[PDB]
């Protein structure tokens, strides 16, 4: 199999409702959609959905980088995922969204050529994944309200965004728990809003509310502080912004910085790198959660789902980006329907047309 | 695709040259060969190469464990390598030879179902790999003659065991270097022979003859000493016995114990674990080499070759077992012909058959 | 004295409760006619060793030690380590038989050659997992037999674990010591949670709460709970013991002859722990029998720092594979006697 | 003073000759030129010159980011450099080129409003800077001849690029030294080409060639390895890629990772952040060198020159980007002339246009 | 077996060149008697013969009625009596092991590991004019000694001189081990060893003060020359600390430092586990009994790879019959006699 040409285009899909997190708001899912065509006719789909608040990547820069990558991989075999990443890494020192776009398309092609769904090529542990649904930052009253709405949709795990103020963040969680009961799993994401000392205080304050885990409580670069929080509370602590790629994961596992790591294809540059992160973590007894950017759509989410279903150590999933989309850019793959169960199917590769 | 049955057999292949080990010798390569048959009729080949003096793995124990694994994985999809290893790990806390046998056959089956050579499912970096060849221990003059013979065959890298006494080691290396010149790479395996400070002395003495690297100069469990050696000599130091699995690799790169890590499928329990080791090392900026057991053959070598060719960070290969076999236990895969370049071809999976 | 010959046979003893103990029994005979007994109890799920592999390894060891003196336990282990990079069951089988021979030649019970601190040891008894009611009923039965310490497996689910402990504790009172074995079932933070919940029922200690290779996680648990934490699977040999005491990973270390390859290595583990101020317990494998338990009992009685014992394998056997040694009768006190060596014959 | 409007445009200036480094080649200086106009009429000039091989930034991404910043700072006082950076950091998690473009324009405006050369506002230690000139990777004898050429131009310090191979890199240096003599200062830049162990071996090999310092011998992320090199050789070791911003500098000085740090406005996001880096370093007894991207032009170089001249602790300068430019995008500022002495003058602000 | 009585007496043996110890005889009800010795070195442990005698007497009465095989309880008893008295404890300990061998009717080395039945010891060269001891060197070598131990740290210029002469006198076939006796600061030790290294030095013993473990670790990490701890290691706890920190390459065991064979076994097994070899040494105040006990232990244990047991060589007479003789020879053969193979 050989790459004949690379097609890239912009996609701007408005979100049904503004997404509010500690870092700011997300109003639209703008992503670069890539199509890698082989000489034999098979076409693979990929997507680069940048989150300027997380990586600093923009749609314009992602588009330019993908074009540079595209003209560099013509003639290569999509199965040579090792060389493909080598080439992209020599071209750009940092562009996970653009790298993920090419990477996902190559894996889609691998599945199509092998005539097997992607999850079978990536580990085959399962053919479906159960995801939580994230509740954006809002008043305690409103948040609890939407929590009940989501539980009625079938969701047994809710991800609560916090990070405006320790006192207010605690009130939000209290209201949600009281409204949904203890049968529902609640995980929090502070998005680097607290100092390590304040983090410990806040986490202990919820000691009776049964919090599953707390995501990135402190600044992404404050590893000493993050390790401090993890060592001071029996609550599970997860790194998100503190872990972009495999090198970051290696550093975190070596230092025992956190208990769990959130993998995002748009942070690590694709499935190729995500596999590395998961295996490094698994080796250290650290489970992983698969996440997403609010800016990605069906393609990115479907790729993430196949990887999550395939790997045993990716025990949690936070793939709710399609639920907020006003429309879908391609057919097939993970639906726009807000539901916890994401079933992959038997179609080859991503199963997207 | 689903596993219908797992068949295992013993394999005994006479060696062209006997292998001398502590308190004994090896005259035949006796391993376990597995054939995993799917409901649709596709069959995958795997091998469990024992090595009692290295891993403690015996042929009898390996055969027994493979049988246990086999009956436990009936009904599973070969692509579900995640569950397959989960099942084997629940059954046995330690059995790298038996786990590799099942693992390799599953990957062979993956290639056959996908109709792709195995290296394409493992990274696809290349479709061939260059291997060194090991020179059996003998008098300096004899080893020198053998060295020239191998160079004539095209080999650009020779491997020899040291740690048999510095004078004897030096004598052999001296004769070899003088016989083939300085364009040929010389890899030494000290097989855990020295104490840390003695290792530094011996390595610096041998270094005068231009040495590419020295493998495992101290006991496998002496990580502090291994790191000491690595930090005191300019010569590249490689861990072998100190690294069996991914957890060992993580410890090694965390401590910055060595310059390179040698993977062996029969030490780590298969391709699945070998990938983890390579990814951990690559992330740490440490390259990997892949070697083989004295008691493995065509299947084990072929699987290792596909992995080495597929992965960029596996930059060295010591896969010469087929060159010392009196006859081939199977058809296809890496041939018995002594040549440095192992070209994999386009046959699906391992390209091996009865 | 010189070793004349080494014999080994597969042994299969039916267990009273689920199916059998499969081990390799060794007989080492000297030129002058003395015969020492040894046992290699595999544990595929713990060490990875199989009976077939253990038998093959023992045969290789046997051939290599012909002519050697059983007292040269230093060389005996040197030879075995040169032959096999890893085979604790096989090494233990040879090792135990050599110590038995040493005792017979010296005409002294084995415990006298191993420290001589005592000539008897008190063991706990493990209750088979079952309904909380059934387990409580058996606990009463065992206490009726004189057992003051009961051992039960946990990590099968917090609610199930608590139900069983609650039932047992309520039926026998608080005078009975309860030690739990978590069998590497929990993640570090889950372990702290589970243990503190179980702690309300007065727990003596918790064995291996996390995976054996997770030493950092194990140390975390130890440092976060008041309950005594014991390493089992995390400690196979002396090198493991040194690492554990060095990092202050646990409160106590559990020794098993089948994990360390015999009395020779077990003595090292105990001396290392004792020097670090860490007490040791000695346990057993589900696959071993009379010989292994007897050897362990002599070592336990002989060493002051081996303060606890979980040597109840013979109580679960339908029959004994040999004559003499620790008997099948379920009793807490294991009295060794004055017979030379292990006092076992076949 | 208040910002009225922000203008941004692309600039594509071909280099007189391709520049080759270990990471790759640079053939043109493509930068985003920013003009910030205030209500009163004063206009400040700034530039964002991204190096994809270093930060992964692209011209297209830099342009989009600057536009986002621009529409967010309307109405702010250019002197409120604290809030301006606050606003930009809230908008993007990473875009030093874009941030530097806005930052430099604000400092230019501060100078114009104060009617003082920028170097006076930034420390006033000096009004000129002496720079080295970099020799791109090439054959030993070719590099040597180029070195003699540069010395004839008045340069007393040459920066030698290496990173193709220990044996080859050593040969390059030997040839250059013997060709120019020991009266010329030679600093090396390996651009992360060597492993810690190989770096030490390579540096010791030149222990007779009088090497002033060695820049970034190992991978950017390998701090333990970088510290190892610094601790094993008496040769001065400088971090470049290992230090982007003040947080990176703090980590490096805390761990004693290196002896000197290379500051680049395009890595740290402008003068505001560069001052932080220099003061953190100065406090730890670590000197700094002011560097540049080959993609920058007169604006970026002039800004860097004023900062370097103003600060005592920025003791070295590697500002040779204008020397390779085919043309200049604006009037005034640092000339295109290849000369070691960069005199600043008395014109207010940057002294441009 | 039961201890009936413990007899202790002071012993004075005349030296050849300018040994006071306590000799113990433990008598069992059965009639067997074990020999032990406590050689106190006031300059090393601060122990005096008077204190050692008083302590041994306290130990003796407390262990009456105990089985000599219960070495675990015997040390327990002694430890509860005195917080520190290695010479006294070794005296009782050695006699108990002698009795164990007699009762079991086996040479002590068989009961301690049985790895070998002989040991090769080095010999110490008295410090003096470079040419003098150099002469004695060629002399000792003629006696069959392949390893010579030399005291250093009396001035780098003087040390290098004496070593140079000896080397050019006996050749490079003879192994030379040096004992710096805590003479240098970590920095000066590195420089000194650095200079002496050119003359092929097997190892350097205790180059820095006993309690400067950080400094000792430094020296060990800076020179490829083998560094051995002596005064820095008295007991098992000390050994554990040293191996945990990788402070040295080798540890010198002395029964008079650790309190007997029981503790010495612990030290050796702790070291062996960490890949650290042990040498067994002796005190200037010891004689036949102490040296013999040490020889049996060293012969029995594989990890005790070196021996510096030359105390009997400087004695004019022996306080007992049997055991290692007074003859200055490299080879110490133990024989088949039970226990220590020593009699009145
Ligand atoms: Mg997050
Ligand atoms: Mg090897
Ligand atoms: Mg247990
Ligand atoms: Mg640079
Ligand atoms: Mg000394």
Q: Which residues contact B14 (CB under 8 A, 6 or more apart)?
A: B27, B28, B29, B325, B326, B327
* Sign of the CA dihedral running A153, A157, A161, A163: positive
What are the chain B neighbours of A114 within 8 Å (beta carbons)? Answer: 113-116, 121
CA–CA separation, D230 and D235 (whole Å)? 8
Task: Report CA torsion sign: B326, B328, B329, B333.
Answer: positive
Neighbouring residues of D330: CB distance < 8 A, sequence distance ≥ 6: D33, D45, D297, D298, D299, D352, D353
Measured CA to CA, the distance from residue B354 to residue B330 in angstroms comes to: 5
HSE, side-chain direction, 13 A CA sphere, residue E238: 21
Return the ∠ at Cα D252 (arms to D248 and D257), rounded to 5°.
145
CB C309 within 8 A of CB C121: yes
Breaks, C-N > 2.5 A, in chain D lie after none
**Distance, C-alpha C186 to centroid of its chain:** 22
CB-CB contact of B36 with B103 (8 Å): no
Work out the end-to-end distance of chain D between its first and last CA atoms, rounded to an integer number of angstroms. Answer: 20
Give the residue ranges of the annotated binding site of D: 134, 159-161, 189, 191, 215, 240, 264, 292-295, 318-320
Cα angle, residue E324 at apex, residues E318 and E327 outer, rounded to 5°: 75
Instruction: From A300, A349, A342, select the one nearest A321 (Cα to Cα).
Output: A300
Chain B interface test: which of D193, D194, D197 (most B C-beta within 10 Å): D197
- Please give, rounded to a whole number of angstroms, the shortest distance from the CA of A337 to a CA of chain D: 31
Q: What angle do CA E327, E329, E330 make, to 5 degrees?
A: 150
C-alpha span between D202 and D194 (Å, rounded): 9
In terms of Cβ atoms closer than 10 Å to its own Cβ (0-12, 13-18, 19+), residue C337 is: exposed
d(CA E249, CA E279): 11
**CA contacts within 13 A on the Cβ side of B195:** 13
Provide the resolution (angstroms).
1.7
CB A105 within 8 A of CB A318: no
Cα–Cα distance for residue pair B212/B27, rounded to 1 Å: 29
Burial (0-12, 13-18, 19+ Cβ within 10 Å), A219: middle
Give the Cα separation of B195 and B225 in Å (integer).
8
With an 8 Å Cβ cutoff, are C107 and E110 in contact? no
Written as six digits, the tokens of A268 are 């690590």
Compute the distance between CA of residue A100 and CA of residue A66 in angstroms, rounded to an integer. 10
Rounded Cα gap, residues C184 and C254, in angstroms: 14
**A76 in B contact zone (CB under 8 Å):** no
Q: Answer whether A274's CB lies under 8 Å from A303's CB.
A: no
Residue E114, by phi and psi: left (phi above 0), alpha (psi -120 to 50) or beta? left
Distance of CA A201 to the CA centre of its chain: 28
Task: State how far the Cα of D4 lies from the Cα of D11, in Å rounded to an integer.
Answer: 23
Q: Is B292 exposed, middle or buried (0-12, 13-18, 19+ CB in 10 A)?
A: buried
CA angle C116, C120, C121 (to 5 degrees): 110
Q: How many whole angstroms separate alpha carbon B313 and alpha carbon B283? A: 10
Q: Cα separations (Å) of B118 from A114, B44, B107, B304, D234? A: 12, 12, 7, 10, 49
Distance CA B234, CA C245 (A): 34
**Distance (Å) of CA C95 to CA B54, B263, C58, C293, E262:** 21, 33, 11, 14, 21
Q: What DSSP string runs through B256-267?
A: T--SEEEE-HHH
Q: Ligand 4 centre from D214 Cα, in Å?
A: 9
Dihedral pair phi/psi, residue E147, rounded to 5°: -135, 130
CA-closest candidate to residue E274, choices E300, E298, E251 = E251
Q: Where are the beta strands (DSSP E) in chain A?
A: 3-21, 24-38, 43-48, 128-130, 133-135, 157-161, 185-189, 211-215, 236-239, 260-263, 287-290, 314-317, 341-343
CA distance readout (Å), E28 to E33, E63, E68: 6, 11, 9
How crowded is residue B45: how many other Cβ atoms within 10 Å of its Cβ?
A: 28
The two most distant CA atoms of chain E are separated, in Å, by 60
β-partners of residue C27 are C7, C37
Residue E24's closest CA among E91, E78, E87?
E91
Mapped onto helix, strand or coil, the DSSP state of residue D9 is strand
- How far apart CA A175 and CA A147 sit, in angstroms, is 10
In the Cβ-directed half-sphere of B246, how many Cα atoms lie within 13 Å? 24
Q: For residue E271, how many other CB atoms are within 10 A of its CB? A: 24
- Chain A nearest-CA distance from C248, in A, is 17
Is E161 buried (19+), middle (13-18) or exposed (0-12) by CB count in 10 A? middle
End-to-end Cα distance, chain C? 21
**Torsional sign, CA A238, A243, A247, A252:** negative
Ion ligand 1: residues, CB within 5 A, are A 189, 215, 240
Q: Which two tokens stand for residue C151?
A: 């051992």
- Tokens 């464990």 locate to B65
Task: State the chains in contact with E (3 or more Cβ–Cβ pairs under 8 Å).
Answer: B, C
Rg (CA), chain A: 19
**Residue carrying the six token digits 């364009």:** B183
Q: Supply φ then ψ for residue D43, to 5 degrees.
A: -125, 135
Distance CA C312, CA C124 (A): 7
Q: Which of B315, B327, B321 is nearest to B300 (CA)?
A: B321
Task: Please indicate if the annotation marks A240 as binding a ligand.
Answer: yes
Beta bridge partners of C39: C25
Nearest residue to D332 (alpha-carbon basis) of D64, D112, D76: D112
Please give the Cα distance from E163 to A138 (Å, whole number). Answer: 83
> C87: which chain B residues are within 8 Å (Cβ-Cβ)?
52, 56
Is the minimum CB–CB distance between A115 and chain C shorter than 8 Å? no
Residue of C nearest to B62 (CA): C53
Query: Torsion over CA of D213, D215, D217 and D223, rounded to 10 degrees?
Result: 110
Torsion angle defined by CA atoms of residues A187, A189, A193 and A197, in that order, rounded to the nearest 10 degrees: 30
Burial group, residue C4, by CB count within 10 angstroms (0-12, 13-18, 19+):
middle
Beta-sheet strands, E only, within B108-171 = 128-130, 133-134, 157-161
The CA distance from E303 to E268, in Å, is 7
Task: Write the DSSP assignment of C294-315 as a string of letters.
Answer: HHHHHHHHH-TTEEEE---GGG
Nearest CB to C108 within list E70, E76, E104:
E104
Query: In whole angstroms, how large is the CA radius of gyration of chain C?
Result: 20
Task: Give the residue among C29, C87, C25 at the shortest CA–CA distance from C60.
Answer: C87
The tokens 């701090």 sit on which residue? D223
CA within 13 Å, CB half, A144: 16
* Tokens matching residue A114: 């092998």
CB-neighbour burial class of residue B49 (10 A; exposed 0-12, middle 13-18, buried 19+)? buried
Start-end of H helices in chain E? 49-62, 71-81, 86-104, 108-111, 130-142, 156-170, 186-196, 213-222, 236-245, 255-258, 261-273, 288-300
The helix/strand/coil state of D121 is helix
SS3 A51: coil
Compute the Cα dihedral for C145, C149, C154, C160 and give only its sign.
positive
Alpha carbon separation from D320 to A107, B300, D180, E27 (Å, rounded): 44, 56, 20, 93
The overall longest dimension of chain C from CA atoms, in Å, is: 60
Angle at B317 between CA B312 and CA B321, to 5 degrees: 145
Angstrom distance (rounded) from CA B128 to CA B214: 25
Nearest chain A Cα distance for residue B62, angstroms: 25
Looking at the complex, does the CB of residue B234 fall below 8 Å from at least one CB of chain D?
yes
Ligand with the closest atom to the CA of E177: 5
Q: Where are the alpha helices (DSSP H) in chain C?
A: 51-64, 73-83, 88-106, 110-113, 132-144, 158-172, 188-198, 215-224, 238-247, 257-260, 263-276, 290-302
**How far is B127 from chain A, CA to nearest CA, in Å?**
10
Closest alpha carbon to C206 in C177, C245, C239: C177
Residue C33: exposed, middle, or buried by beta-carbon count in 10 A (0-12, 13-18, 19+)? exposed
- The β-bridge partners of E19 are none
Query: Which secondary structure element, helix H or strand E, spans residue D214, and what is its range?
Result: strand D211-215
Whether D78 and D110 have beta carbons less than 8 Å apart is answered as yes
In order of their start, the domains of chain B are 1-114 (3.30.390.10), 115-354 (3.20.20.120)
What phi and psi values does residue D255 have, to the nearest 5 degrees?
Answer: -90, -5
CB neighbourhood size of D230 (10 A)? 25
Complete edge-to-edge strand list for the sheet that includes strand C228-231: C125-126, C149-153, C177-181, C205-207, C228-231, C252-255, C279-282, C306-309
Torsion angle defined by CA atoms of residues A305, A307, A311 and A315, in that order, rounded to the nearest 10 degrees: -40
What are the residue numbers of the active site of D?
Answer: 161, 189, 215, 240, 264
Task: Give all strands of the β-sheet with E33-38 in edge-to-edge order.
Answer: E3-12, E20-28, E33-38
> Which token pair is E327?
């003859």
How many of the other CB atoms lie within 10 Å of CB of E158?
Answer: 14
Way it was determined: X-ray
Q: Tell me the longest C-alpha to C-alpha distance in chain A.
A: 60
Which residues, listed in sequence order, are joined to residue D270 by a DSSP beta bridge? none
Q: Which residue has the tokens 């205030």?
A: D38
Query: What is the layout of strands, in order, in the sheet containing D211-215?
Result: D133-135, D157-161, D185-189, D211-215, D236-239, D260-263, D287-290, D314-317
Identify the three-state secondary structure at position E152: coil
CA–CA gap between residue A106 and residue A94 (Å, rounded)? 19
E322 φ, ψ (degrees, to nearest 5): 90, -170
Beta-carbon count within 10 A of B27 CB: 10
Distance E44 CA to ligand 5 centre (A): 10
Would you call E318 exposed, middle or buried from its count of C-beta atoms within 10 A (0-12, 13-18, 19+)? middle
Q: Which two tokens stand for residue A334?
A: 């993970």
Place of tokens 């890893």: C86
Q: Is E27:E33 a contact under the CB 8 Å cutoff?
A: yes
Taking 3-state DSSP, the helix, strand and coil percentages for chain C, each rounded to the nearest 5, stand at 40, 20, 35
Contact A2, A75 (CB under 8 A): yes
CB C219 within 8 A of CB C188: no
Please report which residue ranges of chain D form alpha helices under DSSP H.
59-70, 81-91, 96-114, 118-121, 140-152, 166-180, 196-205, 223-232, 246-255, 265-268, 271-283, 298-310
Q: What is the CA radius of gyration of chain E?
A: 20
């Amino acid at each position: 199999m050989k790459i004949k040409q690379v097609h890239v285009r912009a996609s701007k899909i408005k979100l049904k409702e503004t997404f509010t997190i500690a870092l700011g708001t997300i109003e639209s899912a703008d992503s670069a959609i890539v199509e890698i065509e082989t000489e034999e006719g098979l076409v693979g789909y990929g997507e680069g959905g940048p989150g300027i608040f997380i990586t600093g990547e923009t749609l314009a820069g992602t588009l330019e980088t993908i074009e540079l990558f595209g003209q560099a991989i013509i003639g290569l075999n999509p199965f040579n995922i090792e060389k493909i990443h080598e080439v992209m890494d020599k071209i750009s020192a940092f562009a996970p969204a653009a790298k993920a776009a090419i990477d996902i398309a190559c894996y889609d092609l691998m599945g199509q050529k092998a005539q097997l769904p992607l999850y079978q090529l990536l580990g085959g542990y399962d053919n479906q994944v159960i995801t939580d649904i994230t509740l954006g930052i809002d008043e305690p009253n409103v948040m609890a309200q939407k929590a009940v709405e989501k539980v009625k949709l079938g969701f047994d795990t809710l991800k609560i965004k916090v990070g405006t103020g320790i006192e207010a963040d605690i009130a939000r969680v209290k209201a949600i728990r009281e409204a949904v009961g203890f049968d529902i799993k609640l995980r929090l994401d502070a998005n680097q809003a607290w100092t390590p000392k304040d983090a410990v205080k806040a986490i202990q304050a919820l000691a009776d509310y049964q919090i599953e885990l707390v995501e990135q409580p402190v600044k992404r670069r404050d590893l000493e502080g993050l390790k401090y929080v993890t060592s001071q509370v029996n609550t599970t602590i997860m790194a998100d912004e503190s872990c972009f790629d495999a090198q970051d994961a290696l550093e975190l596992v070596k230092k025992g910085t956190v208990d769990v790591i959130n993998i995002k294809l748009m942070k690590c540059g694709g499935i190729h790198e995500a596999l590395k992160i998961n295996q490094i973590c698994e080796t250290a007894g650290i489970e992983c959660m698969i996440g997403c950017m609010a800016e990605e759509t069906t393609i990115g989410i479907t790729a993430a789902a196949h990887l999550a279903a395939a790997q045993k150590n990716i025990t949690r999933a936070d793939l709710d980006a399609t639920f907020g989309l006003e429309t879908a850019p391609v057919t097939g793959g993970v639906s726009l329907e807000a539901k916890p169960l994401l079933e992959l199917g038997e179609a080859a590769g991503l199963g997207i047309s």
